[model samples]
Target: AAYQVLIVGAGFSGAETAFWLAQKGVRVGLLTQSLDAVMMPFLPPKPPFPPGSLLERAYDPKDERVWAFHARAKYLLEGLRPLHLFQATATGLLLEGNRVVGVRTWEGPPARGEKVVLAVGSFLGARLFLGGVVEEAGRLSEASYPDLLEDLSRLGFRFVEREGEVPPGYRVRYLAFHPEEWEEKTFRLKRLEGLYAVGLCVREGDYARMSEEGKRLAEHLLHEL
Candidate 1:
């Protein structure tokens, strides 16, 4: 059975999409690399430190507010009635000419669906530069941050590259911040008539106004079909 909606990433965008659609009795499949929804890395870490606090002052490892947010997000999602596929990497989009028919995964053949929403997080293949050195290949997950820092260390990239005080620990300063070399490769090459790219992966920090854009994209695709 083809799903009415197929949402990738299972992050804030995907989760919200699932909840809203399921409330309307639409069948939605939420796919993501991790079961736990990691909060936006670009946003400053929350709580324990009150609002308006400086970034350097707010960097507290003992706070664990981000982890708490992740826990709560997972709990809220578990209570929802949407289908969850964990640790599944969407390898490709199955396209029939210009229309997206499904998405291929690592485990098996493509999961057939009429509409595909790509909501994968910002840091997938994102590159960051501190000073003259560049660090590529970092995901947005908290666990992935350490690995990226290690890679940077091996490459002899200093964390304190500039003169201003840098935030302590591995903090993600920007979203989808890549060097000039990677700018062209940032977006997915494959396109499908019914496939829609939304949220930070499409236009960073535009979530506030992107719902209408998504609605228009869905409507346009449906009209084409």
Candidate 2:
């Protein structure tokens, strides 16, 4: 399926962006390895989330609640019909000349979109640290997209790393595209046209901030339309 915007990652920010656009009749697609939005459980567990929002629906059944919030979140997002591209792990970008036109995935046909949003959180050339052990992964047992990062770097995208402030017994390191002069409100990558990054792909923040970023981008795109 064709899309005006192809959003990578189905987490809070991706879903949020897709929701806002689809609500306004934009043709959007959400690509991710998982079938649903994967919410990283908060260390201290942030409570009192906004009702009926994505944050309110994200929780771990093991400790937070008995319900399958991941599935529920997916269900809610399904209502928007963002054309979920499940299990399409992005391997690199599909370029027409110097501009990125879409993404090349590991297990599916290349997806083309006029605009591509790289929303994969903490997964761009990420290296996970667990005390003494380390692995190249987005999350534990999850795949990382170092090749995609390399491709982006070749296209002049600058990135920065941040040491995570985690609880005892574990450690994490995050990598993100350098913000530079590209404003957070626009979420555009300065080095490339038709490219954007939202959520943890740019900086670490609360779900609320990320969700707002998504909405802001949606409005910006709509304005362009």
Candidate 3:
């Protein structure tokens, strides 16, 4: 889809945003570094998927460990005829003329569009930057994305290490901050006018706050165009 929306780092928020964008009448291209990470990338005709998708099972059978949310999220994505799914590393910003039309990946063709959303988890440094120490038991110590974050860096996305605010712990970890204002508010990079930095990627936030933040950003993106 040439007029698709490119979303980087498909986590709960990234997945949710893409789902909502499709609902809002836009083809969406979602890229994730892993399969298990984004609970529901139910692109049909693809093996791990079917017409109804795992969403049908989770709700029809059991809502184990919050599968209802998972089930519904994937089901919602079905609104769009075709969903673009990519399993690669986002290595650069896809540019066309003056607009960021897509995401360039480490492999395969980039997902091109006029909009982009970044729901990148702490995986910017992956399992390395835990508590800002690069190794420790803290937030998002389960990922290993080692390249694309640098791509975002080249795009002028900045990351900072700060103390944990979940409990005011001294265990510091790397968190994304807006270059202009370090506020816990909606995030749109000054460098790229069409890029949105949402959720934990929005600030020092976490997964619990991701869905809402992501949805809000998606709405903004929909309206932005």
Candidate 4:
């Protein structure tokens, strides 16, 4: 719930970032919009150190293997319990003059962090497709953060939607990926310094790639700090 090297969306990307930074004894905090700690809930009690280990684990959102992978991250995070947990919607970045110092939440005073990352997962502006009616949500039946959506637009982040393909013999109606915003070449925002975006691309949600991205971000900050 507190400290520098802050991250948003406690799913794989932010969670993995917390895991790595905690390994280095860096104080970190992760803010979650949906369910908190995607990989922390199932960390094993002790270690066995499997060959290839957690990195080789395949991606499956509903799979129990996440527990094993989380065990590795949790193991690394051991003794580094300063990863404060916050459950809320991050409305925007907190800018001290021209530099970003933290995040602004919809319900409370802003928390502090030397660097701020908006790793909102697919809920930035997510919507769901049912049999006929389209439901506004993060992941089917899950609500998206609308207040922050407006905040992002005001912050000058662009949103782009592209025509998507549907399953061949499946009776589907609406299946387009919208609000595909931000540049993908790098994690940092081009116009904004000390501010970064990660793991917002995948709609169906791929935890493996997202987790890799979390490691990459932590690595980047590790190099910087």
lDDT of each: 0.48, 0.73, 0.57, 0.59
* TM-score to native of every candidate shown: 0.59, 0.85, 0.68, 0.71
- Which candidate achieves the best TM-score against the true structure? 2
Off by over 4 Å in 3: 40-82, 96-99, 128-142, 162-172, 179-186, 206-208
Model 1 misplaced regions, further than 4 Å? 37-64, 128-191, 206-225
| Number of clashing residue pairs, candidate 3 | 6
Residue 44 shift from truth in candidate 3, angstroms: 26
Best by lDDT: 2
lDDT tens digits by residue: candidate 1, 164-201: 11242232332331222122222222322655555445
Per-candidate RMSD vs. true structure? 10.0, 2.9, 7.6, 6.4
Position 193, candidate 4: lDDT: 68
lDDT of 4 by residue, 1-225 (tens): 246688877765677777678777788887776542344422222322222223334233455564555555544444357676657778877876767778788888677787787766556555655566665654444466677767667777666542221231111122221334334544676556677676644233344566667777787888888
Query: Judged by lDDT relative to the true structure, which candidate is superior, 1 or 2?
Result: 2
Q: What is the lDDT, from 0 to 100, of the residue 194 in candidate 2?
A: 81
Prediction 3 global C-alpha lDDT = 0.57
Clash count, candidate 4: 2
Ranking by lDDT: 2, 4, 3, 1
TM-score of 1: 0.59
- Candidates 2 and 4, the one with greater TM-score: 2
Question: Could you tell me the lDDT of residue 21 within candidate 3?
Answer: 75
